[PDB]
Design brief:
Lysozymes have primarily a bacteriolytic function; those in tissues and body fluids are associated with the monocyte-macrophage system and enhance the activity of immunoagents. Has bacteriolytic activity against M.luteus. It is found in: Secreted. One of its GO terms (biological process) is defense response to Gram-positive bacterium. Keywords: Allergen, Antimicrobial, Bacteriolytic enzyme, Disulfide bond, Glycosidase, Hydrolase, Secreted, Signal. The protein is globular, with a radius of gyration of 14 Å. The chain has one domain: Lysozyme. By secondary structure, the protein is mainly alpha-helical. The relative contact order is 0.22. Helices cover about 30% and strands about 5% of the residues. It binds chloride ion, ammonia (2 copies) and platinum (II) ion (PT) (3 copies). One ammonia binds next to loops.
Length: about 130
């Protein structure tokens, strides 16, 4: 599923991301925008051989099992394929653990480089929410 901008903001609020660890909803939607272009099915291979999965590009190095990432952790105790579902629950639940991990949303390089210190409220303007 390629989510609409307001469509996704609504889902994220539902699953309890808005203001989660102090990050307003615009932060989560801007990150999904530059990580995956709102596509639940997005995968990208890292040079280290790990892969990034789903709407928030959660990395197989720490967070999920894909069975081809040598010496990796599965800290969200899930298969990476669960992060590709049209239902974003699994991706939200793992994001909560990542953004609690100490570095906040800086764990998403595209958030640090393209959303951090921007007018992120603009990502939720016009949305019934
Ligand atoms: Cl693995
Ligand atoms: N939820
Ligand atoms: N949903
Ligand atoms: Pt957009
Ligand atoms: Pt949902
Ligand atoms: Pt939820």
């Amino acid at each position: 599923k390629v989510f609409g901008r307001c469509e996704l903001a609504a889902a994220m609020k539902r699953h309890g991301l808005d203001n989660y660890r102090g990050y307003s909803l615009g932060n989560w939607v801007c990150a999904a925008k530059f990580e995956s272009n709102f596509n639940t099915q997005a995968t990208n291979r890292n040079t280290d051989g790990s892969t990034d999965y789903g709407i928030l590009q959660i990395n197989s190095r720490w967070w999920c099992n894909d069975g081809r990432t040598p010496g990796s952790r599965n800290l969200c105790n899930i298969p990476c394929s669960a992060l590709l579902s049209s239902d974003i629950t699994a991706s939200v639940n793992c994001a909560k653990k990542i953004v609690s991990d100490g570095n906040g949303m800086n764990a998403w390089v595209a958030w640090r480089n393209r959303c951090k210190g921007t007018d992120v409220q603009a990502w939720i303007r016009g949305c019934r929410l």
